[PDB]
Design a protein around this ligand. Sequence first.
Ligand SMILES: C[C@]12CCC(=O)C=C1CC[C@H]1[C@@H]3CC[C@](O)(C(=O)CO)[C@@]3(C)C[C@H](O)[C@@]12F
Length: 244
Amino acid sequence: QPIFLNVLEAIEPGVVCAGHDNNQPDSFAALHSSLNELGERQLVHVVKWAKALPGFRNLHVDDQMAVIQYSWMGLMVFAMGWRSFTNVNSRMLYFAPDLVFNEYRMHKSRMYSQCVRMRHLSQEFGWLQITPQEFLCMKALLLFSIIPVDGLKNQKFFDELRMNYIKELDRIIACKRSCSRRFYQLTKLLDSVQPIARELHQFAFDLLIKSHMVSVDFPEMMAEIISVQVPKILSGKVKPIYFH
Ligand SMILES: C[C@]12CCC(=O)C=C1CC[C@H]1[C@@H]3CC[C@](O)(C(=O)CO)[C@@]3(C)C[C@H](O)[C@@]12F
């Protein structure tokens, strides 16, 4: 009955700070430096969260790491939109308690238009009156929404898992106070995460290439993920799974 949701609610990670020094002038290098540090700290929590999801450890251990490394951008963007919605009504981007983007930061970060798309995504939680239970189920399904075109180590295991998480989603909708219309809406929202994720992937890749010239620092796990895993997505070897 409520077992699936009990689990999702119990493993939801808590607040992560970026460690940003807000006394610092808002500059390109300092902002993306803080975001990267934020990314590394969140990644640590995403790994632990994913390993505790129902059935995840049924995946080959090789596949476990890969789906986390391919889907983390979308997961983090989606969670960030939810944070922004529930904390500042999506009026600004709430990356962390200590790293809230206003319009000035959007511009200095040189990714203003991507931020606007992130704010639009954020605004959807509000437009659709997304429930915390729908949020949690949708976020779990994002973990299973991007894979190699030539499939994973144990692809059949991934397919049943993904199948069951879509089922849990229909269930959370069907257990609400037109399910058909809701499901269509939440799948469109989920799909909308991917193009955004793809823009940020491109942006981080370009930044990492010119890192040593724009004075932006990359913590270890990120320099690795962005030079080993992200190019596979930008080169089309790894592609999102779209509903529509
Ligand atoms: C997932 C993070 C961090 C954690 C978070 O709540 C939201 C996002 C989405 C935007 C990402 C940034 C967009 C460009 C970026 O700043 C860089 O590419 C730095 O070079 C990124 C990729 C750093 C970091 O990873 C992100 F902030």
